[model samples]
Target: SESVAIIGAGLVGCLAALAFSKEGYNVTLYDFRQDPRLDTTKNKNLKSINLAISARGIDALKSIDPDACEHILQDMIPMKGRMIHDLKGRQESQLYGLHGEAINSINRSVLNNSLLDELEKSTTELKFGHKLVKIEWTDDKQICHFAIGEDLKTPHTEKYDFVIGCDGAYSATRSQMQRKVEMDFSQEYMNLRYIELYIPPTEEFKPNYGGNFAIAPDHLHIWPRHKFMLIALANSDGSFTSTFFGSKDQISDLITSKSRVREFLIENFPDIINIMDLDDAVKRFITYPKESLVCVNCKPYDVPGGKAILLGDAAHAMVPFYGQGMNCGFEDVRILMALLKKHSGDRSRAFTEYTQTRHKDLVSITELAKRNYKEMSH
Candidate 1:
């Protein structure tokens, strides 16, 4: 049985570990952070843009294990359309499909944790707090170097038949892959910035929605002002995870003062004041984590001889405007697995075919995402 080290226990990494383990390979999952399931993970990020699990992402998870997929996705709220809020507070509902087709919304950590739980139930080993620092690739083995412990003080080494890199935008594994392959890569920072905000559940349960939700829970709410936008997705608990996206200069000016943020939000999204406190929103705008979106595009994602491979955001991190970042990452695993099966575990042949066949699709999706930015904002 071949042993594989899957780096990054995030969504794609966890799924890859489970997929490989089900195929009877020895799989071990590694992550640079502490176990998120632990209460001690105080940085239990409550502030992140909720991900949309569209058909592609759903199909990828279901293909792995239908039963586990169902369990993991139990709490996803289906958003049937976009509820566009005008400056005058008039709402326009635009359905994505004529038949009420919808994309499921889920919290990022919730999905990642569920995937991790599935990994725990399987034979795949979990190695949290293991930060990959280097990779030594040979003809027959991929030796991985990891920094161990909470302080990341001790160095530990392991050997695997192959390695899977799902370590996100700034993947350490991708850096290692660069050393071995003459890979084409570029990381471009978009002109956009984002700040996470929350819309609290109502004090009283609304009979119309059968929940404490303050607005229509079935639709994604968007306050689009052309220059910037605020989007909200429903949570199972009746709250909404919202994010404000705008140009770096615009956000910088808004966050300069609490009053400026308040005036801007009130002027732009007047209807939000009734549901979300302007003071709290202004505070969050001024103090929340300001994140920059970077697009990572790379080719030849696999090292020759299949000693190592890159998947998910490591290979192609696109803007989330198209909501395909996670879907594309999940799809990467599905496509790679299909190629591996077709090649009957011949790593070199399968991995080579992966790069040849998958690169174009990924590049296209990356382009689609960048273009979608204008579609959403304007």
Candidate 2:
């Protein structure tokens, strides 16, 4: 069996680890951060921006391991369609499909932890607090250098048959690959900024829903304000992860006057003000860090001789407006795994074909995500 070094422990990396382990590969997953599931860690984040897992993500998980997918995704709540909230407090439902197609919502951290738990039961090794600084590649072997913890001055090196880079949009592995290969890459940043907000669960549980939800848990609630928008997805605990998106200048201007933010919320999202604590909302709006969205696309994701390859955000990072970033990453795992099996475990043939065959599809998805931003904000 070939030994593999996966450069990230994120959703895609974890899935890749498990998938490779099933094929009897000696897999080791590495991450710069500590074990997030541990309780002793300070500044623990139990809440993450919820993710909507549609067929694209679900089918990918199922392909890896059906039983594991069922166990890991047990808590996801299904969203049948979009529930658009107009300025006048009127609501409209736009179904996703004719036969009630739905997307599942799950917290990002929770889902990631569940995948890590699955890794513990498998043969894959998990290494935390290891950051990749550089990679020394050749035709037969790849030597990866890492900066361990505070010892940035010194580095540790490991060799693997091949390297998989799932380290996200700003990937050190991708950077290292650029030095060795003629890979074409481009990144574009949207002017929009996003701030995460929370909505607590309702006081009482509704019998039909079996949970204490303030709003319809089966729909993705969106308050579209033309240039800006507020979207919320349900959690199993009955709470909702809500995020507000707008231009940096618009959010900056709004935060300058606290009263203006309150006025803006009440004027545009009147229903949210009734359900959410208005005071808390204003405070979060002004204090929360604003984040920018970026779209990344690259060509020829694999190095020659299949010595290394980029996956997930490292290969192609798309904006979340289309809700396909993670989904596409998951699909990457399935596609690569299938190609590996097709070539009878030949990394050189599998990876070369992957970069050649998968480039067109990746470009299309990235383009779709860019175009979807307009449709996302209404």
Candidate 3:
């Protein structure tokens, strides 16, 4: 009646653990890697942009812990709406709301790690480097197996009342759960290819440039074409997270020569490319891989009276085109916790309710995420 195991230790997992602990339950959170916050040598995409966290994301964070939400919201950059750019360098600004309502864009990695760091402060137990290989469910207890480090022999198995899977798109926990339940899963790779690149702010007003700022940081920039496009969002440090999405053949044809790539950018996103480091952006473009994200859905998340359940990307991994992957994940924790309360601290009833109510919304959002690539990128 007291203990639970949460898998993945991602944005969703951390929030789930906090919510479970608040209910006076013993929670054990597990992840497959070293604590990301403490890891110093991790290399991130330089053009990493902040996500515009809307009402849903904010409510989820505040519901878990009001003070925690305040702590994380301090560094967000408010984005009003999309700044659509036309072929001739003409720009159109769209406002998100009438009264200056904005969806705040916060760094993705920073937010995930911040949530993890705060989760560590909890009295609940945490097991890092624990990759969930299997879950065994009984009438009263759940058993978990983990492979951590060199000696895969250490604490291979443990027990708990229930388990939650927050592991990413390639979730071991979900794979394990599918063997036990009827899960309908399909993964499709989008035709569009993307490469992450940077548009660092110019330094000291170069001889060729005009102003101190390279581009405005207040709006999300889009150089959208009919089928393929490029998008950039502002960062706190004056740089922008620019991502280009197009056909593989098109990229291959362009990258064959530096001149071709330059001409393409000039023909398409000529307005912003001048301020970006021409040489550096092109080099990254030629080398990086464009990953296609997938969507997953399953019926009846509760395994035998809420003994085991799935959450986050493990339960539903959608594309980043809509920027809803993590936000939707965070909402999973909030919604599940509310059900737990309605059932009077009954995990089984709460988990049952979650599976029944959340699946429809999850499936709906995933469909929306799938179509957004066409709207946001094209």
Candidate 4:
């Protein structure tokens, strides 16, 4: 009797679809891009930032389907603490917890692909390559207009009982809501730029650490230079996914030439030259995309009467330094579902209560992430 259309097949969106489908709502998942599993998800310039799913994220997944959550997280590598590396090659490990608590690291592609695979095995309808152009909201239903195939001129329209906007920071669904609701919103583009780099494993396996890891695989390695930082997380393929975050102007200046990139990296991270190839790293810095980081916040995440609601990146896009972005997004699913159940699927009461309760949390975390950007680099 009910139907929901989820925009953007991202992690949060996928989870929302599964939850809705399990609850007996007909769910349809849409994304503008083709199936990501079919594309080259790895070795891409602007992709693959290894995600650290905290216990919060895991708990939220378990709330949906415990058995499925267990399987989906089986490939994750446990990260026990932070490994701080100084410029002189000194290593320091800071234990996050005394009771063996850990945050698990998994490749973004692996997790997302796993979610998509799970959805395929389930009853939810998966529609890829269908871009959501606009959403026409009426008092009774939401008319979603999507562009099909190659022709972007005309839109294919469908109506749903309600819509879930998980598109992204610059969410199409959020903009559509703007036309219907007087939403309070703000966006700030951070000056930092990030580039993903690869850190290959050691040539031989070492029994002490139980793997062919150049550095300890049990920790998130960070090379903090005060002005900028380099961080790495271990991968199952005996490699480390490293990222460099620096000022936008600095990255722009370094990418001007291969030599500049080389000199800057060596001067800042003298120890890294031994673990990874400087020439290849230089090439990547010069060629790979300099991804921008932005902070986006909005109020009253739902349109009145639950006509539509925003989640994850769509509702609040925060920096990743705290590693709370995904966890918070996952929590959004949990809280929203709980509210719906509490209100007996009463869209009005549940969604209204969500904004009233969830806003403080979302705002604090968003501010916390921004504050940590200073705490981390400065």
Q: Is candidate 1 or candidate 4 better by lDDT?
A: 1
Candidate 1 structure quality by residue, lDDT tens digits, 1-378: 999999998788988998999999999999888899998887754336578788888999999999988888888888778999999999999989765336888878888888888888899999988999999999988899999886677566999999999998889999998999998999988888888788899989999986999899989888878778888988888898888888889888778788888988889989988889888888888887776677998889999998888998888988865547778889999998999899999999999999999999878878877887856555
Query: Candidate 4 lDDT (Cα, whole model)?
Result: 0.86
Candidate 3: Cα lDDT at 139: 79
Write candidate 4's Cα lDDT for 1-378 as tens digits.
598999988889999988888888989999877787775443322245688888889999999989988889987898879999898878999989776447888878778888888899888999877889888888898999998766654555999999999998889999999999999999998887888888898889978777888888899999988779999999887789999888888888878888888998988888898789998899888887656677899988999978999999899988866536778889999999999999999998899999999999888878877887867656
lDDT of each: 0.86, 0.86, 0.76, 0.86
Q: How close is every model to the real structure, measured as TM-score?
A: 0.95, 0.95, 0.90, 0.95
> What would the per-residue lDDT of candidate 2 be over residues 300-356, giving only the tens digit for each residue?
899888898999988998877664778889999999999999999888899999998
Q: For residues 61-159, what per-residue lDDT tens digits would candidate 3 score against the true structure?
A: 999889988988887877768889998889898877775445777887888777777777877687876777787767777788888775665666999
Name model 2 segments beyond 4 Å from true. 43-47, 98-101, 153-155, 374-378
Give the lDDT of residue 16 in candidate 3: 85
Model 1 CA deviation exceeding 4 Å by range = 45-49, 98-101, 374-378
Candidate 2's displacement at residue 86, Å, is: 0.6
- Cα RMSD for candidates in order: 1.9, 1.9, 3.5, 2.1
